[PDB]
């Protein structure tokens, strides 16, 4: 069989996540088709959720170390929202991995902006790669983050850096429990442009991982209100929201109703690196002890490993509803589980169309999670027309650019805006007193108001969005700023 660096990777995860190893078969015809594969690979990894496909994340990096003819280093991609300190805690005490690591995790948009040559350094504090050449000699995973197609402003950014990223023949695995014939398309398309070697893996229907997660029953209701209303003492509770402000109000509440003050928790993206850091761990020191309520936004959807009893949860469209449901019963002796959805809640960053589309089309096909066949459909009906609102000119120029080696972020900003711009989502690091936190340019503005913001090394005063995108504009070129953060940063809520 000649696969060693799998075998690696799969002792070495079962030891520090304490499970006893299993067959898990799609795993390794995905590593293998990689591996061998005489032109270069665009794997599409169709599992569902809690399958345990970041394996062949950890095995294609081991892989590295012994054979890069292929690729140099693995670079995981989360989606945009989510945390990525879960991951880094593993691949750190399972593997003990400006320096090359043999495995990055990035997130969906710091990746789309090193593709455009711009400045990403303070996100990847020593630093493990600040250079578009360092991706293009990598393999790099998309884990659930290709959904940043759903996002309006940031359809045709992204677009450009998968169709600048096959221009180059770089392997390309995209790993999602929710892949509509939509993205499918999209994804075939730039794989047969450029002679890829396409391939999609979905597990069979006699497949171990799906038979046994049919013996667990766990229903899913609807409600409407407050999500307090529904908590359950005695048991894991989970309240994952679609916003910031709406889990730290939720949380504010929380901390004296529950039982047991310690066991409540509080986690999202406005927080710093090491806080996020002490929360992972104790939350993996919860997960063997008891019960605990974990209140959280979208970030704890994607890179957190979790499994709760009861699950309370804001509408959303499918693709990060099947995300949320997937940490009810996650693990192997976990039978019975709950989820309430709340129809009334607030949309925040979803479009309106999409969640109530699921929301309709769940309700007449009651589906069952970690089983495809009951919410695949709804996933190809939901997640569809993309290339409505793609700037198919300003798409050709980044491509463009990306080509050029002589072309700098100077001349990707300026030709961004001749077609203030897509810069309404590059965040801007926000200094805390040692650690450091990400903001988008309008909640710089909001904390300017409130003069809790000192900026170093820039003159203008900011009110007037157009001056924060400003400040967003200068970090991206690299230019010697510090935004800085004069309150007190507060050790449970985060940054407002
Ligand atoms: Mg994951």
Request: proline share 14%; no cysteine.
């Given at each position: 069989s000649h696969m060693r660096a799998f075998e690696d990777a799969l002792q070495k995860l079962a030891k520090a996540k304490g499970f006893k190893p299993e067959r898990r078969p799609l795993l390794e015809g995905a590593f293998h088709f990689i591996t061998s594969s005489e032109k270069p690979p665009f794997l599409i990894l169709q599992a569902p959720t809690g399958y345990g496909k970041t394996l062949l994340s950890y095995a294609l990096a081991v892989h590295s170390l012994y054979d890069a003819k292929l690729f140099d280093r693995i670079i995981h991609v989360l989606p945009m929202r989510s945390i990525i300190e879960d991951i880094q805690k593993t691949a750190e005490e399972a593997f003990g991995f400006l320096h090359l690591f043999p495995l990055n995790i990035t997130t969906a948009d710091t990746f789309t902006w090193d593709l455009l040559k711009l400045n990403t350094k303070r996100r990847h504090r020593g630093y493990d790669y600040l250079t578009q050449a360092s991706i293009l000699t990598s393999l790099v995973i998309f884990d659930e983050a290709?959904?940043?197609?759903?996002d309006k402003s940031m359809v045709t950014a992204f677009l450009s850096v998968i169709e600048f990223l096959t221009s180059q023949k770089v392997p390309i695995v995209i790993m999602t429990a929710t892949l509509s014939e939509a993205h499918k398309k999209i994804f075939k398309k730039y794989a047969n442009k450029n002679n890829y070697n396409f391939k999609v893996l979905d597990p069979e229907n006699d497949d171990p991982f799906i038979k046994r997660e049919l013996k667990k029953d766990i229903k899913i209701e609807f409600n409407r209100g407050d999500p307090l209303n529904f908590i359950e003492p005695g048991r894991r509770n989970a309240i994952i929201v679609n916003s910031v402000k709406r889990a730290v109000e939720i949380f504010d509440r929380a901390k004296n109703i529950?039982?047991?003050?310690?066991?409540v928790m509080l986690i999202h993206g406005r927080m710093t690196s090491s806080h996020k850091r002490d929360l992972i761990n104790c939350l993996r020191k919860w997960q063997k002890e008891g019960d605990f309520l974990l209140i959280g936004t979208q970030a704890v959807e994607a890179g957190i490993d979790f499994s709760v009893d009861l699950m309370i949860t804001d509408r959303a469209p499918i693709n990060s509803l099947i995300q949320r449901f997937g940490r009810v019963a996650r693990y192997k002796n976990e039978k019975e589980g709950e989820i309430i959805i709340l129809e009334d809640a607030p949309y925040g960053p979803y479009p309106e169309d999409k969640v109530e589309k699921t929301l309709d089309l769940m309700k007449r096909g009651q589906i069952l999670p970690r089983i495809p066949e009951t919410y695949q459909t709804i996933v190809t009906e939901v997640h569809r027309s993309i290339t409505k609102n793609v700037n198919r000119e300003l798409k050709g120029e980044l491509v463009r650019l990306m080509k050029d080696?002589?072309?700098r972020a100077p001349d990707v900003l300026s030709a961004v805006e001749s077609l203030i711009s897509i810069m309404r989502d590059f965040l801007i690091p926000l200094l805390v007193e040692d650690d450091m936190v990400l903001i988008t340019p309008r909640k710089l503005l909001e904390l300017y108001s409130k003069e809790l913001v000192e900026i170093k090394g820039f003159n203008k005063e900011i009110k007037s969005l157009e001056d924060a995108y400003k400040v967003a504009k200068s970090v991206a070129l690299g230019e010697n700023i510090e935004i800085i953060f004069i309150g007190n940063y507060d050790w449970e809520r985060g940054i407002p």
């Open positions: 290709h959904f940043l197609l759903e529950w039982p047991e003050r310690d066991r080696p002589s072309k």
